[PDB]
Symmetry: C3
Subunit: 117 residues, 3 copies
């Protein structure tokens, strides 16, 4: 199925989030997952009270929930992509980023008054 | 056990969140799960920077973590309920909502200086 | 591997969050998990619109994602620790706290352009 969602939490200021970033994340993830952009959801949360390694330089905590398209090599590619994007667009060092991956069962994803199973 | 928690993240403005909405979610979920309202926790996050399908009309990303009471049919009923509530109260179209469901092991839920196992 | 991350969401005001709290959480969790503080990430979210049991006294919803070091007894110790910290520092009653525990596969944790597997 086509469902995937990406969340990034960061201490980086809202002003540093470029315009079009939501569409950028959406479409890059659509390319990466082989899912249509219409069912990719994205959520960016700046100005958070956060630390990585006990210090407060720019950092991010992210998650990608997806129905399928999750696994070792795939997650490696996603990590390369997303760390690249966060470094280029949000000035965050890749070694200060965690991304948690979740392969969701269709039956555990609600949408449009039902689930995807 | 009685533990369940619901989170909704949305780009909908804080002003559009009606008064009593937390209690409404709590009690509707208590009905739905057959759990006492005293152990239902609720978290609503408005004004978020979000997109669904690459566009920023009202949308929501939600999760329901629960000890038990999670599964295909149950999740379908929850989705009908919650999409209904989000549409009625938050003006969000049900086809712009994801709800992730999690059946949590008692041993993986901390509360009151211990866990539920 | 060394990766662990902790998030706490609470309705408690930002002003009630003491200075040094991020480092405190980081180091206490480093002690608790036997992981180096350099790979512990922490995220604190105050002033949230939240309820526990349908009422809005101070409460928290937290999560600890970790590569390993998760299980029954361990989670009990973590819960004692974290509820203690939240009560002492954030004035939150331990019976109004949920902490969800996640043992993450190395292959499902992205960091530094790759994963931990």
């Amino acid at each position: 199925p086509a469902a995937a969602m990406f969340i990034v939490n960061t201490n980086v200021p809202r002003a540093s989030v470029p315009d079009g970033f939501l569409s950028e994340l959406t479409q890059q993830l659509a390319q990466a997952t082989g899912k249509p952009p219409q069912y990719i959801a994205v959520h960016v949360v700046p100005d958070q009270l956060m630390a990585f390694g006990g210090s407060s330089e720019p950092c991010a905590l992210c998650s990608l929930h997806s129905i399928g398209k999750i696994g070792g090599a795939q997650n490696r590619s996603y990590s390369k992509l997303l760390c690249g994007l966060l470094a280029e667009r949000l000035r965050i060092s890749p070694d200060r980023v965690y991304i948690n991956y979740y392969d969701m069962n269709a039956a555990n994803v609600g949408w449009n008054n039902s689930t995807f199973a």
